[PDB]
Amino acid sequence: LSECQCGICMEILVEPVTLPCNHTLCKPCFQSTVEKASLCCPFCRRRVSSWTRYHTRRNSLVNVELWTIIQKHYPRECKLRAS
Amino acid sequence: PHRYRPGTVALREIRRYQKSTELLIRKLPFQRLVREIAQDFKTDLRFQSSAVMALQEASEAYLVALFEDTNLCAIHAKRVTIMPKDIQLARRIRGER
Amino acid sequence: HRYRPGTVALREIRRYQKSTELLIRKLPFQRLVREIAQDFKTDLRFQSSAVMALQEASEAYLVALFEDTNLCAIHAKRVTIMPKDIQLARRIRGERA
Amino acid sequence: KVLRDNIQGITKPAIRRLARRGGVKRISGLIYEETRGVLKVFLENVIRDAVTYTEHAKRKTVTAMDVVYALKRQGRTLYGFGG
Amino acid sequence: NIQGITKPAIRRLARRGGVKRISGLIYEETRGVLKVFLENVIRDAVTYTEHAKRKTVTAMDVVYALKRQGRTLYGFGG
Amino acid sequence: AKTRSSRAGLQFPVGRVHRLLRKGNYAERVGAGAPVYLAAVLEYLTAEILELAGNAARDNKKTRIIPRHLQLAVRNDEELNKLLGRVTIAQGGVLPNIQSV
Amino acid sequence: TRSSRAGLQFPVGRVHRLLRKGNYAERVGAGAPVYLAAVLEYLTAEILELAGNAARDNKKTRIIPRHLQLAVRNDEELNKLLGRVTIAQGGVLPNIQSVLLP
Amino acid sequence: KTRKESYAIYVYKVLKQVHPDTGISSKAMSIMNSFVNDVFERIAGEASRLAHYNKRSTITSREIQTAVRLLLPGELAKHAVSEGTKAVTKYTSAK
Amino acid sequence: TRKESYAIYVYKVLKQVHPDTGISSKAMSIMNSFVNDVFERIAGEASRLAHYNKRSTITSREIQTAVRLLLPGELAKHAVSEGTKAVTKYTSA
DNA sequence: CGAGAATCCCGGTGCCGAGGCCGCTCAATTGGTCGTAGACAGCTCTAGCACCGCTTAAACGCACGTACGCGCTGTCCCCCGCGTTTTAACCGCCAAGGGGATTACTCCCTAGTCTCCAGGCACGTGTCAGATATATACATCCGA
DNA sequence: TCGGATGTATATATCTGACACGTGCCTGGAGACTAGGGAGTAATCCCCTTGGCGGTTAAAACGCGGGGGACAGCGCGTACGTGCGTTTAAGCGGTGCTAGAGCTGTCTACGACCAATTGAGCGGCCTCGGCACCGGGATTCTCGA
Ligand SMILES: [Zn+2]
């Protein structure tokens, strides 16, 4: 759960996005803190603008491999955050 | 009765249209198309008839040049008929995208 | 033993597309440039950097032209490039009249 | 009024006359769609530029000056409509 | 002079371009087109240098000439 | 003569080209013989184009020059065709040409 | 400075000097240097990121003209933008026609 | 010794921010300088042309915004105008 | 309002060369556009040369080099001859 | 499926270009004033949109049948790969002086300003070159 | 190879509007002055370009053999040109309307110019490691089988 919650808003990671600096953030919060505001990593300040451009072009922002694991382990938490 | 063989009427037509200068694509359909294309980008634009005429001028010139190059490519291929591969080669060698 | 024709060709093709150094030797090219400039005005002096820049530009332009001739040749169903291909490519580009 | 399928107003006899002026002799059946596509993209670019010029002018009317000046931007200058 | 551009060099240029098989007249044709291109570029550059009141053709002038001809080149303080 | 055009024996106005250059931000300052030079070059160019336009008009048995005559002139003159190789003339048309095959 | 005033990395003073010295207009506004510095900075950031990615893929720790060429000609809209620029010591992309293959 | 100016230190700053563990060759800095100069020239020239055109003698943020929209292709131009508007509002916030 | 144009000037030239030929409005407008086109081309080239050569004023030499660079060979030669004759006339009288 | 070189993957040395630090002068900052380009309001008339109807020229669909695109075959000869001989490009090194760069000096060419006025502007009006319709005379292209 | 018919070109009239000219008026053009900076010119220094000469060495040149590629002939089948009949909508031309382009007054916030002050940035000096180069092994392919 602690590893499965993003460190910014502390809620469970829903639609997590793993930046190339290996960091991960939850989605409504990814685009609230990064996509439209800074285009940089909240912790290591790595610029990510072209990364987001390419992924939004190819719709691959949400790590499927980790997302499936999270849904299998904490489906109730995922549903509670979604609601 | 009579039927011209294929080709002679084609030469007659090309000489007819190379002698004259009037516009060929019909003006009301062209205006409708350009108004639609404009409506795609921003809403509520009005157009000068002179602007529509200028757009028609440029489109005519561009398409005639393209067809000239396509004919050159088709002749190079030892053919008489032009095809979309000829069109694509013309655009590629021109360097358009 | 002997490789069949074309395999050494494509091996060289790969080797040369992987490389980045210039292909034309410096002294003949410099003598060519000096001879060309001699016709226009007498007793000019050249920077080595200027000669290198001219070499760069000529290199790139020739490579691009050969790409276009290869495209035309393969369109003609041939596999060997020919002078007519270069002529047509230049005409379509619009350099030659 | 909503406009739709106006690209079909470019009739195949008109396409034929364009080719006949261009010097073509024999015409295939599949080239009408290709000509429509190329005309579409060309109009898209020129209309984009003209609309942006008018937008910057703070007007609601697209003018012959704007169209001519867009065509000059594209390096396809046109004479006879002012400037 | 103009035949200084030798045929293995022409072959290497073609190989870099992606050409597989070459004919005999390609060499003379390539010599012609290269001669035309060089003529134009050095004419423009020499005009620039003549205006500048200098007897040394500088790479900056060549970069300006190429910019005029629509063949911009990077890497010489442009 | 008072006017610079009459001073130099030209038809194009030196004062007009002087004002245009001053209101063009081409340089902080402008010279004196520059407008005269530019006007002379412009006049020669117009004379050059009118040569061929008039000759084509006489060929077509007309008293007035028109865009078709101008287009024919430009595309028959080799050098001016290289100068205006990327120009479209309204109502210009295309030269009558059929390729051999 | 004005650069730190907006968090940019490019010189507001230099670009303001250049706009005047180029005689582009009679007068120049205040937001112009900030806007132009921002756009230049973002463009250079894009180019550097792509070039560095290509270089790291090639397994080297510095950017060279070949890495720059790979980055520019590998991306679609950047190729469109620099469609008329020849890069010194850039080389050409590996591309062979299908039919030409054995 | 002429005091020629360059963008090298700021290019290096941007590279340090984006890719920390990477270096640059002097040749590469040359192309980066030329590229920055070329983009600057194109934007300034078209903006001056626009300002002349609308019979207005001042070049402003609106002029440069239209400049970016005409010159750069769609996606990048959107990103650039976003970045620019962020920068200008941040600047005008402080004095 | 006033719409400046070179109409009377083109008419003067045409009357000088072909006394028996008149001009239409479309052709007149085409000629007016062509003059402005060459005007901006030459002026921009001269401005670039002046800025590059670190000079604060453009002059006859600048426009001479501009015409030489722009027009092709024989046209440029005759144009430069015309220009030098005209400037010599102006400076002499 | 076999060999068998070309190329790919690998450990060692070392050396020249990258990264860091130094310090000073010219460009950035700051403060201030004055004037004009620019923002905002108000009124007004060309023109762009919408409509309707009548007319007729142009677009559709069909049929037919013949010229051309396409695959196949054969043949002849023109490049490709390899081995051997000749040659000049490449590097290092030394000499030399022509001309690019910088600084000082000075006179003259031009922006800015004010005063006069006429060549260029719009507006009104007259008439002949040319589009259109229509009547006529030949070139020629294909069926017989 | 003559002959019909259909397109083209030719001739003629005529009525119309587009071009040419007269005319009158106001903004741009011409003349005169100034003072101030920018270009012209002399001189000096030193840097970079040119020239020469040779040494090993890889690249260029030449010959040769053959096999794969280009080019010509042939035959088949279908897709497009041509003619005709029917349908559709574009073109011409009045009418009506109002939304927006264009012109003008007023006032004002914002940017050019000038003087004082300082520190970021450029030329220089330094130092050390990333990759050029190279000798040893694996592979990833090509070609004969
Ligand atoms: Zn991070």
Numbering used by the authors:
A (entry chain K): 11 to 93
B (entry chain A): 38 to 134
C (entry chain E): 39 to 135
D (entry chain B): 20 to 102
E (entry chain F): 25 to 102
F (entry chain G): 14 to 114
G (entry chain C): 16 to 117
H (entry chain D): 28 to 122
Manuscript excerpt for this entry:
The nucleosome core particle serves as the primary structural unit of chromatin and consists of ∼147 base pairs of DNA wrapping around a histone octamer composed of two copies each of histones H2A, H2B, H3, and H4. Among all binding hot spots on the nucleosome disk surface, nucleosome acidic patch emerges as a primary docking platform recognized by wide array of protein complexes, including histone chaperones, chromatin remodelers, and histone ubiquitination ligases. RNF168, a well-known E3 ubiquitin ligase, is recognized for its role in ubiquitinating H2AK13/K15 through a complex with UbcH5c. Additionally, this analytical method was used to study RING-family ubiquitin E3 ligase RNF168, demonstrating that RNF168 dimerization enhances its binding to the nucleosome, a finding confirmed by cryogenic-electron microscopy structural analysis.
To resolve this spatial constraint, we engineered a single-chain construct scE3'-E3-E2 by fusing RNF168 (1–92) to the scE3-E2 scaffold via a flexible five-residue linker. This design maintains the functional dimer geometry. Despite that, scE3'-E3-E2 presents a higher ubiquitination activity than scE3-E2. Importantly, scE3'-E3-E2 exhibited enhanced stability compared to scE3-E2 during nucleosome complex preparation and cryo-EM data collection, enabling structure determination at 3.9 Å resolution. Although limited local resolution at the E3'-E3 interface precludes detailed modeling, the map reveals E3' contacts with both the H2A C-terminal tail and SHL-6.5 DNA. These interactions suggest RING domain-mediated enhancement of nucleosome binding. In the E3'-E3-E2-nucleosome complex structure, the primary E3 (E3) docks at the nucleosome acidic patch, whereas the secondary E3 (E3') interacts with the H2A C-terminal tail and SHL-6.5 DNA, a binding mode resembling BRE1–BRE1 (RNF20–RNF40) dimerization. This dual interaction positions the E2 (UbcH5c) catalytic domain over H2A K13/K15, consistent with its known ubiquitination sites.
